[PDB]
């Protein structure tokens, strides 16, 4: 690694990242996912989001640091995962992606993976 960014918080570990990124991609294929900052910021304003994933090592980090303060008002969990390049892949994109918002459909197929991971994430926010 490199010095993990002090502002990065909650930071998911190795074992949670595998469980999270796997859900991301699993949602990508049902197109319940939304990738990128602005696409994610849109979600919260509307009110459809489930949780946000962000890149920890996003350079500079200040460009996404607004999401946390928005999430806390809409009561939406969030975490950082350790690299952007990995998050890029899971969304089905060649290229680096710093944020992503899974959305809501309560008829969904993957519904029970999501509640699983939010339950894990909200633990990190102590």
């Amino acid at each position: 690694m490199s010095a993990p960014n002090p502002k990065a918080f909650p930071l998911a570990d190795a074992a949670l990242t595998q469980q999270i990124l796997d859900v991301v991609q699993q949602a990508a294929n049902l197109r319940q996912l939304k990738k990128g900052a602005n696409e994610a910021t849109k979600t919260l304003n509307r009110g459809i989001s489930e949780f946000i994933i962000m890149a920890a090592d996003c350079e500079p980090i200040e460009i996404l640091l607004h999401l946390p303060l928005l999430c806390e008002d809409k009561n939406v969990p969030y975490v950082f995962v350790p690299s952007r390049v990995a998050l890029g892949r899971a969304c089905g994109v060649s290229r680096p992606v710093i944020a992503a918002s899974i959305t809501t459909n309560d008829a969904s197929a993957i519904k029970t993976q999501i509640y699983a991971v939010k339950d894990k994430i909200e633990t990190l926010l102590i």
């Binding site: 602005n38 500079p60 200040e62 460009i63 996404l64 640091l65 607004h66």
Partner: protein, 70 residues
């Protein structure tokens, strides 16, 4: 309002629709930094990259193809 700005109308007319979009994003990136920034200390530096890119990127759009061997 952005359309009237400097970083757009200093360029040929063909590259306008490509430079709003390219600038509008970097405005919001700039504006997101401003909220983040502490009131007592505000530091520019982000802008310098985001102008450098923009002016250099706008040039390249204008430049046009290299000529081709027949």
């Amino acid at each position: 309002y952005l359309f009237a700005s400097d970083m757009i109308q200093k360029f040929p007319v063909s590259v306008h629709k490509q430079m709003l979009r390219m600038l509008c994003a970097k405005v919001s990136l700039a504006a997101r930094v401003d909220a983040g920034q502490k009131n007592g200390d505000r530091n520019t530096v982000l802008a310098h990259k985001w102008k450098a890119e923009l002016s250099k990127k706008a040039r390249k759009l204008s430049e046009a193809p290299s000529i081709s061997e027949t």
